[PDB]
Amino acid sequence: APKPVGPYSQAVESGCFMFVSGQIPINPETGALEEGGFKESAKRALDNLKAIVEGAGYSMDDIVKVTVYITDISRFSEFNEVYREYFNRPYPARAVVGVAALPLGAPLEVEAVLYT
């Protein structure tokens, strides 16, 4: 399972919300980024989330907001794709940017909140 790295908690139960440190595509059991470079990562990084989310007894489709960060151009689509398999209608108001640099180099990263 994902292990927060640094000065953060990968989630906090305050109020009727759950704040999640932007998750990272590390094979939790291999503390290394995923293999592939494109979708793989963008796939696991999400699974990597799909997890903690569930920890605190919580359906993801219960998530009201999600905020992503992408290092690369257009893989909006290659990603936009993988997003679906996880969140089913309705969806959570979501942001999306083009960073330029990320932790350990990670292809992307994603925080998100949700009401419990």
By C-alpha distance, which of 35, 42, 19, 13 is closest to 102?
42
DSSP letters of 49-87? HHHHHHHTS--GGG--EEEEEESSSSHHHHHHHHHHTT-
Closest by alpha carbon to 2, among 54, 75, 78?
Answer: 54
By three-state DSSP, how is residue 30 classified?
A: helix
Q: Measure Cα distances from 19 to 9, 35, 72, 75, 115 in Å.
A: 9, 28, 25, 26, 9
The token pair that represents 23 in the structure block: 């998750």
Closest Cα partner for 115 from 38, 63, 80?
Answer: 63
Cα–Cα distance measured from residue 25 to residue 47, given in angstroms and rounded to the nearest whole number:
9
Task: Report d(CA 77, CA 83) in Å as an integer.
Answer: 10
- N-terminal to C-terminal alpha carbon distance within the chain: 21
| Whether the Cβ atoms of residue 52 and residue 58 lie closer than 8 Å to each other | no
d(CA 93, CA 77): 17
Domains and CATH numbers, the chain: 1-116 (3.30.1330.40)
CB 114 within 8 A of CB 58: yes
Q: Which helix (H) or strand (E) holds 23?
A: strand 17-23
* Structure-determination technique: X-ray
Residue 18, both tokens: 């759950």
Resolution value (Å, 1 decimal): 3.6
31: CB partners within 8 A, 6+ apart: 3
